[PDB]
Structures are given as C-alpha cells and as structure tokens.
C-alpha cells in the first residue's frame, strides 16, 4: 500500500493548492466590472452593428456564446499545439484585474474569476466589458474612442451624428487587440494588413459579412 499513500499525498497537495488558488481569486470582485459602463465613451454591444461584434468574435472567440468561460477546443490548440488561447471572458478578467502580471498562479485564479463573471453576467454584458476595456493603441481603451480617434466613425448603430464604422475598420480594430504592439493602425505594415485579411476571411467564413462586403473591405485594404 505504498503507491496509494504517495498518489494520495500528491493528489491532495494539488487539491490543496487548487483550493488556495480559489481563495486568492476571491476576490478579485467581479461586481467591479460594472465600473466599465461609467466610461465617457461606453457603448454596449447590443448597440453595435453585428459585423462589428463579429469582427471580434471570429478573430478572438468564435464560439463565444457557446462556452461558460473556458473553451476546451480553443485551449487545446492553444496548448503549444503548432488565435488563442484565451476566451473573451478570460481577456476581460485579465484586462480589468491582472493589468500587470502573467504568472502560472495568476492563470489559475483567472480561471476561477472567469467562471464567476459568466455566472454573474450575461454574454452581451461580457462582450460589452471586452469591447470597452481593451487597448487599441494611441491611448484608446474603448472601441468607440478607438473608432472615433483613428477613423472618425462610430460603432453605435443608432447614431445619426457620426459616420458609421465600416467592415474594414471593424476588422482593423479587432485585429489590433492582440496584434504585436508594433502593429500601427496609423501606418499599417504588410504583416498588419495580412493579419486583418485573415480577420476578414473569418468574418466571411462565419457569415458576419457576405461576399460583397468582404471584397469591398479587401479592396479598401489595398490602396
Ligand atoms: Mg480558453
């Protein structure tokens, strides 16, 4: 009975470690996320055109609405298995709280917190937290701030005061979020335009846009 007393002491130390991690993640109070809706330029996802929401979903988390914070498939491909690996929920937790570090223990507590926001918030609210708290360069942390700043367009579908964000622009912004900081929307390199091209194929292949919109976007991309 030697191999069971060691398999046990190990199985418990991990469960003990995992238990502590929970308490560390607690909290980390997800109620805090509502503070994002106070931003001067906050626009909720439900008030954005569908291709805009889809520029981000197809690029970052194509099964966004299906999961409960953790995407197994996307996280296996992501496990250094030759567009991952964090779900939009995980990125929301990372951006709001762990604005600083990226350690293994932070990655485990990040999982606990993510589960908690999925529990507390609906998918639309979570998508709104995401789009309103990511870095798009030039000190822009909101999609609308970004859209205004780079293009002078808006992402509020209801808006009538400002021109509407194009398919290309939605794809530039979505591509920028996890692009290397070197990618500069003010002066796009070939690697950047290649990246958005991919974002566009995905939008088309997932039917957030049709062939026509896509071709028009690609065309605009190449001037
Ligand atoms: Mg994941």
From Swiss-Prot:
It is a single-pass membrane protein. It comes from the Bacteria. GO terms for biological process: cell wall organization; peptidoglycan biosynthetic process; regulation of cell shape. Its main location: membrane. The chain crosses the membrane at residues 6-26. GO terms for molecular function: peptidoglycan glycosyltransferase activity. Belongs to the glycosyltransferase 51 family. This is Monofunctional glycosyltransferase. It comes from Staphylococcus aureus (strain Mu50 / ATCC 700699). The gene is mgt.
């Amino acid at each position: 009975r030697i191999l069971l007393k060691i398999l046990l002491t190990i199985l418990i130390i991990i469960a003990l470690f995992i238990g502590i991690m929970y308490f560390l993640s607690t909290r980390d109070n997800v109620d805090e996320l509502r503070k994002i809706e106070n931003k001067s330029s906050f626009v909720s996802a439900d008030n954005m055109p569908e291709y805009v929401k889809g520029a981000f979903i197809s690029m970052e988390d194509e099964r966004f609405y299906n999961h409960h914070g953790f995407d197994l498939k996307g996280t296996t491909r992501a496990l250094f298995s030759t567009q991952g690996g964090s779900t939009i929920t995980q990125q929301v937790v990372k951006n709001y709280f762990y604005d600083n570090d990226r350690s293994f223990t932070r990655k485990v507590k990040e999982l606990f917190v993510a589960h908690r926001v999925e529990k507390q918030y609906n998918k639309n609210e979570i998508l709104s937290f995401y789009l309103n708290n990511i870095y798009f360069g030039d000190n822009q942390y909101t999609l609308e701030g970004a859209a205004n700043h780079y293009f002078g367009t808006t992402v509020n579908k209801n808006s009538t005061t400002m021109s509407h964000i194009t398919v290309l622009q939605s794809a530039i912004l979505a591509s920028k979020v996890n692009a290397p900081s070197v990618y500069n929307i003010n002066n796009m390199s070939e690697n950047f335009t290649q990246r958005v091209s991919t974002n566009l194929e995905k939008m088309k292949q997932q039917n957030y846009i049709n062939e026509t919109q896509y071709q028009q976007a690609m065309s605009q991309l190449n001037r």
